[PDB]
């Protein structure tokens, strides 16, 4: 169950990031919305910076350092 | 024979710490190869599930692989419970 | 120079630590396990010169996984454009990126 | 996101190295080196390496720099490259370190022989005559 | 090079399981015993496809099966389960060792009913 | 006599009593009246994060029981 | 409400250390057929306050020629380490719960020699320098054996977590499992804090005094947790707190008793004591404690 | 020191060298280098005095710095490519630091300054060991990464090494400094053919090791550390002086002696690789090494220097402790030119 | 390649330059060597932990052990030099010259 | 964040109380009127450093008990401790622990 929920949450976060990318990158001349940085079409696990790039600093800091700082 | 016994007697006096240290170290070296429970410890270490057991793709020719955890097929840990 | 004792004797003295995808304890995977596996399988049995000439795509993908330079450049460009637009004022973040969303398990 | 705390610690590390690299009054260079070692421990512990950070902070600071000070006294951007998943129900760093006895037999053998040889070398050099 | 395909938000919509970790831990053994088939199908597909986007239907199925499991628990043995998971939730480590008594009460209620 | 030593030992005993009881009381107060959740190994931390997301008040110790399953 | 927890951990330790000195005098006095302070206060209870006020009103004899820097830093580091060493310990619940608490305590003790080194070097005298070198050598020598003993004992615990020691000793004390290691640990903790029979040596002076006494009480508490495990009931931690404080006070009184009972070693005599009696036994028992869980198939769980 | 301790230290040195050559992991190679450095220091300090201690501390400083630079090269290579196997370097910056660290270990110019001083400080047996056995490991590591080295850097450092050795050998009276400068020049000759053919490098290494073993054993046989003390050898053992003159002629590259083989083969290979100016410069520069070899031979055997009255008592006593393999080393270092095509074994 | 790695590399370069300067006091030379090793340790630890290459967690401990052994060797050599000359000044090592 | 705050509180209290201790008796006006270098201390310091390094090698033992290679792990740990004992014995026999 945890694996399924994690996959669904990651996919939703990626989709929201893609939608906001489409909104922002409209007037950029040579930008392609949702373009890969890898030649292969295989699924690649996203970084912390890909999912929380455009979000608030509080939850970015949480998702990156909370487990280390939780004592 | 007699010389070794006399040397051990002389060392047990005025040098008990070294005799005890050597005895404990040598005993700790020899004993594990003779004790029968080291196999039990290895089995307990193998029987500890750290990862998720990934299921196998059934093809109709695996009688030893269970289809449900409650099925008799597969390893049993009744020996650990009896310990 | 290189006296290859190990392969002659089949000893495996220090090969177990050479690559990420080689028998990690508790089957812990490397971050770039798949890319390194693909590159190694591409370049096996071919030679260094031909491996460099032919397996360049796999090596590029592996290095991109390792250092993520292109990903950081892309994210920085997106963030810079977003900051420029919010500075001018034609863009407003949605509630998802302002902490007012509905979280899920 | 606290103003690039990793960047701040790295800069403090660099300033500490600038401080003790000028080599003024070797005791003060020593204090600069303890400061820089503590900052490096902070960096390692903040990144996620608890055991390796404590390894530095114990061995390096308490033994090696202490012997250095003893001998002197006798004389006159970030957060994006991180992971996404979890580690299971154990710390990967500690398990990989503890695999030294099950996997790194060669490493243990060579390190132990090197330390014994180093003891012999120290005794021979300090013999004098 | 290429475009990453991501399923739309309508494909990710499903009735979530809104119970806490202690509640899940209290029924973890029975949940594993009962809901094993969809979970194993999902996990086999997960390691075989190596792609999260290829396993959405199995995730929905396992969510539905877990929901059915919890609905049966609520229908039959709500109160012993409530006591058991409250006990589990009180402890910081969530130890099964603490209240084998409540565990046995829940187990006997489940065995008698379902 | 020897029992005149006792007042100082009792003062030290109370002083040493204060930290443990204070910490336990603060842990109960700040964790919804229950024992503080300890989280090593990065899995129970994920459990705490999931509980925080499920609670709806951004607090992990607020437990949602079987009544939230509808 | 975390600053409140930190203050309620720190201040009672300071009161206990101040009161501990009064207790020490009374115990020694009654072992010497006399009384301790009993005039200042009902039973000498006001003696620590008078001592503190007199120390804080007397001028500090700064040499006016040495480096003021380390002269002021050394008490800071000493007191900071002494107060910081308290947080990892679980009574029953630790202020800060760390996975590798034991290594943290060991690293703190390792840094504890820098205060001695800097105080000796900043005294601007060669004789105090010799004394500081002797003390530093003794401390590092005995901390080696501390580390070996501690890892050998934790081999029966499963990890370096201090909270797990309570679960390990739920049914039996660790004193029964390994009493020789406890004996050597007790002696090494005596030699660590420069306590008799190993004691070869106004504001900052009292600073160092409180640092040393906090280290003493901390060492007794750590020994009690490591070797005399109390039962912990999650619904009433006050019982565990009371039992732990009783054991810690018993061990502190044991240090006072040992000081009042024995003459003191020479420097070379204690150096030989360590390097020729404790280290061989420590290595032999480390080998034995490595081998024992494997022989008996009793390896501790957590990993 | 105790013979057991000396034998164990020698074993540790050679086992570190073996671990360096047989390991496929960068960390194990670094460990072998550390083991070699750790066990080498007491050998340099077998005869305790201020000179040996100063030489040993200079050597330790240089080798520790080189090892740290090598470790950073390994770290940067790992950063830019998650590989530990000794293969192509994968980073331009990493290669530059690895090359400089290995050259500092070898003593190539401009990292040559420590070699003459360390050779002068230590005794003759220590100098023999330092100049023979301490080159196997860095040269093996360089041969393993031959396709990665920047040819410009390797060739310019080799040319600098040859020039420095040839120029510095002219000013020396002590023999140990002469051997050190000869070692520097031969190191440059070895490392200038690495980008083209490592077999030539190994052949030059073997010929150099044989010749320098013969020369150091001859210097041990007749207790001479300066030119004048060597000039007294003809009065007691003229055979030693004649053999040393023949060996010195061999080291200069004069045919038909063995020393001509490495220069000839390296020049031939580099002319295969369309390089013409460099081998000519190498030959005209090695003429200087030949000049100071000729001066030493003049002072040693081709003339008779004045003697002393006390040599008559030395006439009556025989060299008691006789070393083996000296005739074999001389024969190999003088008369193996006709067996040149045997280099195809990839020695 | 992020900025933390750049900072660590600059720290190592600063330590190397300080080692190569030699104002005086060989003790400072050993201090610079140890600082270089500390930079090596921190950088290797970050690189190894970042990529989740579990089997390489062994390496920093081995590096620290070997480098501290080398540091002890250098300390012994410096002690003997100082005992010979009375001080650890660099210029006293001028008896052997090129 | 918690341990940083705890360390900051410890250092802050220590500094504040040390400064008040050093400044309270200064407000009122008053009159306000080598070579030896023993080798044994350095030798024991170096011995401590070497044994500390070998202890650092020996530290990860508690997790090494769960590897499924119990025989190999036991052999390696016993080998490390045996070499520690051998180092101590070698320093003992040639008078490395004398005063
Ligand atoms: C002064 C002239 C040189 C004299 C050299 C010393 C002569 C005595 C040495 C005694 C025997 C040495 C070798 C030991 C015999 C078995 C070793 C064998 O199993 O190893 C082989 C190694 O082969 C040996 O090296 C060949 C030995 C022949 C050396 C003599 C060649 C000298 C030619 C020019 C001088 C004329 C010499 C005249 C007689 C001495 C396998 O090679 P391999 O591991 O797979 O590849 C590694 C090498 N790579 C990396 C370059 C590819
Ligand atoms: C063949 C030539 C032998 C004589 C020449 C010796 C040369 C110098 C001595 C050094 C060589 C020793 C070889 C040790 C290499 C280790 C690998 C080999 O021994 O196999 C190991 C066998 O393990 C044994 O326990 C090794 C014990 C041997 C070490 C004890 C004595 C070592 C002394 C060596 C010299 C050190 C100084 C002198 C000490 C007296 C690995 O066990 P295994 O389980 O399959 O694989 C682990 C990987 N897993 C996780 C996938 C399972
Ligand atoms: C002083 C000691 C500094 C570090 C002590 C704390 C060590 C520690 O383990 O705490 C780390 C803790 C949790 O780690 P785990 O125990 O593994 O468990 C986490 C999962 N529940 O989280 C943290 O890392 C928080 C602190 C990290 C950042 C700051 C570290 C301290 C830096 C101190 C720098 C000052 C040095 C001054 C020089 C000293 C010279 C005498
Ligand atoms: C466990 C609890 C222990 C608590 C720790 C100790 C706390 C100490 C508290 C100190 C209380 C204040 C000390 C006041 C007395 C200071 C010493 C003193 O008497 O000096 C008198 C001195 C004499 O100087 P002269 O006569 O002019 O010159 C003679 C030489 N030619 O006069 C002074 O300087 C007086 C100073 C003004 C003090 C007035 C305020 C009282 C103190 C307030 C508390 C301040 C800190 C809290
Ligand atoms: C085979 C197992 C290996 C592992 C076990 C050992 C691990 C740790 C123990 C060894 C630590 C280091 C030992 C170093 C030994 C040094 C001996 C020495 O030099 O001391 C001699 C003296 O010591 C001796 O007599 C030499 C050895 C004495 C006996 C040693 C033990 C011999 C075997 C005893 C045990 C036999 C087996 C156990 C059976 C017991 C019955 C159950 C000089 O002493 P000084 O302090 O200088 O005194 C001078 C002024 N009086
Ligand atoms: C079948 C498997 C069984 C496994 C075998 C295990 C059995 C082990 C049996 C042997 C145990 C012996 C080790 C116990 C400690 C030994 C330490 C020692 O021997 O050192 C003393 C020295 O120790 C001291 O003298 C230090 C004393 C300092 C004063 C301390 C006072 C202690 C009394 C107060 C109470 C102590 C409380 C201890 C327990 C604390 C619990 C937390 C001997 O040295 P010397 O007399 O000088 O002789 C050398 C020349 N021949």
Swiss-Prot record, chain D:
It is found in: Mitochondrion inner membrane. It is an enzyme of class 7 (translocase). Pfam families: Oxidored_q3. It is a multi-pass membrane protein. One of its GO terms (biological process) is mitochondrial electron transport, NADH to ubiquinone. The chain crosses the membrane at residues 1-21, 25-45, 47-67, 103-123. Its EC number is 7.1.1.2. Its main location: mitochondrion. It catalyses: a ubiquinone + NADH + 5 H(+)(in) = a ubiquinol + NAD(+) + 4 H(+)(out). The keyword Transit peptide does not apply. Keywords: Electron transport, Membrane, Mitochondrion, Mitochondrion inner membrane, NAD, Respiratory chain, Translocase, Transmembrane, Transmembrane helix, Transport, Ubiquinone. One of its GO terms (molecular function) is NADH dehydrogenase (ubiquinone) activity. The keyword Electron transport applies. It comes from the Eukaryota. Core subunit of the mitochondrial membrane respiratory chain NADH dehydrogenase (Complex I) which catalyzes electron transfer from NADH through the respiratory chain, using ubiquinone as an electron acceptor. Essential for the catalytic activity and assembly of complex I. Belongs to the complex I subunit 6 family. Core subunit of respiratory chain NADH dehydrogenase (Complex I) which is composed of 45 different subunits. This is NADH-ubiquinone oxidoreductase chain 6. The gene is MT-ND6.
Curated annotation (Swiss-Prot), chain G:
It is found in: Mitochondrion inner membrane. The chain crosses the membrane at residues 2-22, 68-88, 100-120, 146-166, 171-191, 208-228, 238-258, 279-299. InterPro entries: NADH_UbQ_OxRdtase_su1/FPO (IPR001694), NADH_UbQ_OxRdtase_su1_CS (IPR018086). GO terms for cellular component: mitochondrial inner membrane; respiratory chain complex I. Signal peptide: none annotated. It holds the Pfam family NADHdh. GO terms for biological process: aerobic respiration; mitochondrial electron transport, NADH to ubiquinone; mitochondrial respiratory chain complex I assembly. It is an enzyme of class 7 (translocase). Its main location: mitochondrion. GO terms for molecular function: NADH dehydrogenase (ubiquinone) activity. It is a multi-pass membrane protein. It comes from the Eukaryota. Keywords: Electron transport, Membrane, Mitochondrion, Mitochondrion inner membrane, NAD, Respiratory chain, Translocase, Transmembrane, Transmembrane helix, Transport, Ubiquinone. It catalyses: a ubiquinone + NADH + 5 H(+)(in) = a ubiquinol + NAD(+) + 4 H(+)(out). Core subunit of the mitochondrial membrane respiratory chain NADH dehydrogenase (Complex I) which catalyzes electron transfer from NADH through the respiratory chain, using ubiquinone as an electron acceptor. Essential for the catalytic activity and assembly of complex I. HAMAP family: NDH1_NuoH. PANTHER family: NADH DEHYDROGENASE SUBUNIT 1 (PTHR11432), NADH-UBIQUINONE OXIDOREDUCTASE CHAIN 1 (PTHR11432:SF3). Belongs to the complex I subunit 1 family. Core subunit of respiratory chain NADH dehydrogenase (Complex I) which is composed of 45 different subunits.
From Swiss-Prot, chain I:
It catalyses: a ubiquinone + NADH + 5 H(+)(in) = a ubiquinol + NAD(+) + 4 H(+)(out). It is an enzyme of class 7 (translocase). Belongs to the complex I subunit 4L family. The keyword Ion transport does not apply. It is found in: Mitochondrion inner membrane. Its EC number is 7.1.1.2. Core subunit of respiratory chain NADH dehydrogenase (Complex I) which is composed of 45 different subunits. One of its GO terms (molecular function) is NADH dehydrogenase (ubiquinone) activity. Disulfide bonds: none annotated. Core subunit of the mitochondrial membrane respiratory chain NADH dehydrogenase (Complex I) which catalyzes electron transfer from NADH through the respiratory chain, using ubiquinone as an electron acceptor. Part of the enzyme membrane arm which is embedded in the lipid bilayer and involved in proton translocation. It is a multi-pass membrane protein. This is NADH-ubiquinone oxidoreductase chain 4L. The gene is MT-ND4L. One of its GO terms (biological process) is ATP synthesis coupled electron transport. The chain crosses the membrane at residues 1-21, 29-49, 61-81. One of its GO terms (cellular component) is respiratory chain complex I. Keywords: Electron transport, Membrane, Mitochondrion, Mitochondrion inner membrane, NAD, Respiratory chain, Translocase, Transmembrane, Transmembrane helix, Transport, Ubiquinone. Pfam families: Oxidored_q2 (PF00420). Coiled coil: none annotated.
Swiss-Prot record, chain J:
GO terms for cellular component: mitochondrial inner membrane; respiratory chain complex I. This is NADH-ubiquinone oxidoreductase chain 3. The lineage of its organism: Eukaryota, Metazoa, Chordata, Craniata, Vertebrata. It is found in: Mitochondrion inner membrane. GO terms for biological process: mitochondrial electron transport, NADH to ubiquinone. The chain crosses the membrane at residues 3-23, 41-61, 72-92. Its main location: mitochondrion. The gene is MT-ND3. PANTHER family: NADH-UBIQUINONE OXIDOREDUCTASE CHAIN 3 (PTHR11058:SF9). Keywords: Electron transport, Membrane, Mitochondrion, Mitochondrion inner membrane, NAD, Respiratory chain, Translocase, Transmembrane, Transmembrane helix, Transport, Ubiquinone. One of its GO terms (molecular function) is NADH dehydrogenase (ubiquinone) activity.
